[PDB]
Amino acid sequence: LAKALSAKQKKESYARSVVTKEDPEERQR
Amino acid sequence: MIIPVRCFSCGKVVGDKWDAYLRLLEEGKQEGDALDELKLKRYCCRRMVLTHVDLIEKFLRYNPLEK
């Protein structure tokens, strides 16, 4: 129980990285 | 930045003893013994070599601006 509760709160990563190849405002214009 | 040519207090030439000081420290001599070997008797001159920081070695790690 201690191991599970300690390692449960260790994993925290919501945002996912990405690579931008052009100017973001291109879709808007 | 780089070792001063003269001692600030009395003006003894200390700018020719930096490499010999580093050599003596490499051989295993203590700093006081190394300063004694270089014939720096007055503590005003000993301060110049004992407290110098060689910053030019850090400045030289940046790539040259003109070639």
Partner: protein, 45 residues
């Protein structure tokens, strides 16, 4: 995700059709900083 749902409703009568329009917010994506020049090209900053 605090307020993940915008909702617009329109009980159109012009045959009663109750229409709900709603948009959901999903994942957040981040990138490394980029620089966009006047000529249109991009490169890592």
């Amino acid at each position: 995700w605090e307020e993940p749902r915008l909702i617009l409703d329109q009980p159109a009568q012009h045959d009663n059709i109750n229409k709900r329009y709603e948009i959901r917010f999903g994942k957040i994506y981040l990138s490394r900083p980029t620089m966009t020049e006047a000529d249109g090209t991009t490169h890592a900053m």
